[model samples]
Target chain A: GTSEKEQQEAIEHIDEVQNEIDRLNEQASEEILKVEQKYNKLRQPFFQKRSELIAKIPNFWVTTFVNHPQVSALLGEEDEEALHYLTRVEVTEFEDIKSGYRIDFYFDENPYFENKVLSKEFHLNESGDPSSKSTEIKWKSGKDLTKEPESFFTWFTDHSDAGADELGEVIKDDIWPNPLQYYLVPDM
Target chain B: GTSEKEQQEAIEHIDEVQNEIDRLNEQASEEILKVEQKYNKLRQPFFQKRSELIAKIPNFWVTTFVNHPQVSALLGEEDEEALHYLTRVEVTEFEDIKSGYRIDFYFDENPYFENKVLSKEFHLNESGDPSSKSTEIKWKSGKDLTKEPESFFTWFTDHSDAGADELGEVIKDDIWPNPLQYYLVPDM
Candidate 1:
């Protein structure tokens, strides 16, 4: 180490700038979050109205899901057959937006499942743990969709093992935000 | 085609939702831009203060560029040698924030160049064309650094060909925001 007092003092001054810069960046992030929160609430009614209108269309959820790349990859022939009964798909962010979110697949009575709604929810506590839970999928008779790992319906019951959390985010971030785009995808 | 009146009305309702959703998304983007514009002004003083402090340190810019992966790849032995005289780096967003930005490299008196500051600026007009410009680099005698294509200083003069435009963005987005991190990178 050289006896350079100039370099030492210069380094300390550089740290002062870093500290001030970090403080400003954090403050800007907080302001951005506030704006996102405001718009999230404001956009709720439009999402609700969209879901209501979507229910009137036959095989709306199936058409949308099949058209999406990531989602369609998770489908088998039988899974798509079951998805015809899916009337609407809804995703709701928790009050804090960052805290948690839930994705619900609302279905009409179908041959495969007795349940009216299958939902998956992801939550985080203070300790920074991702604790996810989902509704128990009860298959009727000899029809068990969970047997097919590739089935989209199998994801509804995939909770603690974390098979579907990423897909859940994909739906929340892209699919649910603009479902019409997927539903109206052009034939290749 | 089925003569189902319900399906036709449902499709029309879906279009209404699409229209409303597009309107809301655009509005949110406009609001986000406003917040970004406001914080950009707030952040100016901190950045200015950083540049002023950075001028006190010797080779702060070279040290930072050397430590950065993308920047270091562009440097030859001569480039690093010339960079020792680099005292500070400053990037300024245009008045509108989105319209333009400029990167100015301040150097001490060195044997290689006569110019104290070498700068690059990028601007977008109403026609949506990116017209970038930079201060002409004047090398002293046979001490020209621009002959080496890989040299970092050569980027200052690479205005129209867009050779250094991506790296210019790298500096603006990452390096300029947190130069101290690069300067103090752990020697691995």
Candidate 2:
């Protein structure tokens, strides 16, 4: 039978080899990152092309949002009604993905507001702390959707609170990755 | 407002663009697949050497599991007590990793069981359904751990039910991937 003292001695040696293994693991992850960057760059043109096609589709973004389990939570009846005027939505990941990304919503001129576009950008500091900012909504007198349970644009203007970041991840990770599924979700 | 007929026409066109985007994604995925396969092979010898090194440390797996956030929840006091006999834990991914992996627990002779090792193997059928199997623990009469809210070996013997599979994935993904961090959690 091995004693605990001997077992204690064993891990001291185990930790040494583990360091080498961790080093190799670091290399493995580095290679995986480069591969992601390679495809991230490679896939941009298709996204742009999809954007062009999506422009002609009325209610695409609104339908996709309402169909999503998490993103839909932000919408009220009025928010969904206002979103009917949304003509296009664009997501641009920064050149350095780690730096962050932005989402832009283009609108048809409507009774709700004068702004043709609403945009929000997300970033991270050197310490990897997140910072998110959005264009102020200039609503027609008393026509604000920003003031809810809460409104969708309120989510845009909000800083990176617990709820705010979770929604962004749902959009970027779950929604944007395959919007087609959400758009087709009702049909399914 | 864009007419419904026109919007209907738009997705037909959008569908065309989505197909091109999907094709690019398929290629992107193929490249990602090749990268994982490359590293999986390159990392093999390191894993093998790590296993040989791990064999020398008694109580390593038990220490790591008891320290873990998720896996620890599955261990009751008696379950942990039984695990004190665990000498080494080995996780072996099959030749094709997607096919599955096996986790074998080597034990010293203990009062509870006659077996030297208890092994659980997880697999994916061709249709991508998950299937898991484990060695039956012939717990000595009146000394069974499988009969309660559950024991660690109870988890080992169970099939692909809800709680059962989550334990396997936690071990494979979180614990085995970087066990040292879990082992070192107390000092942190």
Candidate 3:
């Protein structure tokens, strides 16, 4: 008799993002070293450089994909609606001294998918040879303005400010040449 | 006599996250219609650009706060142990697949907080005019890399890959590279 040939129940493959995240986190940590506290401030620029690198990595794929009729048709009405199901609807709430605001955004697809990765790295060390310690920051930007556009911007803005309310205030100011700039010269 | 002031608890704030998300999602949907899905690949790149730009928004206050030697000294004690506490540990249960891997890559002293902000059309054209529809994701990286480094990297990596994957693959080989490249060299 077959040894315990039991009917196995099939498990539905729900996307356990945390699982993939944990997997990648462990692997990266092993290879990543800690930043010297003395050099911590130096790390900010590095992080900046990294973000810059990532902002440029997806146009190529979109251009290429759009050229293909299959890809184009694949993005048609029903198809978009179906995959859009996996898309998420996000809400965010926050308050400024002046007022409280609520925000929302959506995901059409995971940009981390196969066709949207474009980023660069920076190695800033005077040691002739660049080391991870030289400071490496990866940067890139997304292409689909329709999907979660605010996510990236807000994240970047938040990260850059870290924990400085005043700095956040200043940065907020810099985001526009002047508060009235929006009124005078509309964003194109 | 009216109820105690404490008991009165004037509701200074209430957040309808779901409603906010629905509103933003609707705006995003309307705009998504403007850009042909042929450009879906552009989604990731666009977000990256937004993230980078937003991140550039600076935290001059945090910088000043950290630069103050007195402030840095006041927060003495190498709080490295605190990281272990904040650190989340996990193990992969698989064969030769680097199972039982431990990871602690999600936490926040200050983290990016995002809201799906939608533009209500100053001019009223949801033709995806970069302004007609948009989002605002916000978060900070925290003062110290005191927590697990992987969390930041994971976020950066995830943040970098914000919107282009349709089922599988991201970025074009010629223009962009794999997400794994930041940590490891590509074999292909």
Which ten residues in a row are the worst by lDDT in model 2 chain B? B155-164
lDDT (Cα, tens digit) per residue for candidate 3, span B82-105: 222221111111121212111112
Interface RMSD of each: 2.7, 3.1, 23.9
Give each model a TM-score: 0.84, 0.83, 0.14
Runs of candidate 2 exceeding 4 Å displacement = A1-9, A66-70, A160-164, A180-188, B1-9, B76-78, B95-98, B147-149, B160-164, B181-188
lDDT of 1 at A93: 88
Provide the overall lDDT of each model, using Cα atoms, as 2-decimal numbers: 0.80, 0.77, 0.27
Query: How well does candidate 2 reproduce the true complex, by DockQ?
Result: 0.49
- Give residue B68's error in model 1 in angstroms: 2.5
The best candidate in terms of TM-score:
1
lDDT of 1 by residue, A1-188 (tens): 22368667767777886787788788877877777777788889989888777777778889988999898999899988999988888888876644688888888899888999998888875666776778888889988877645677767656664434789889999988888877885558
Rank order by lDDT, top first?
Answer: 1, 2, 3
lDDT per residue as tens, model 2, B22-62: 77778877776777667667777766776776676667778
Task: Please identify model 1 stretches exceeding 4 Å from their true place.
Answer: A1-7, A125-131, A157-166, A185-188, B1-3, B95-98, B123-133, B146-149, B157-166, B185-188
Clashing pairs in 2: none
User: Which wins on lDDT, candidate 1 or candidate 3?
Assistant: 1
Candidate 1 RMSD to the correct structure = 4.0
**Greater-lDDT candidate between 1 and 2:** 1
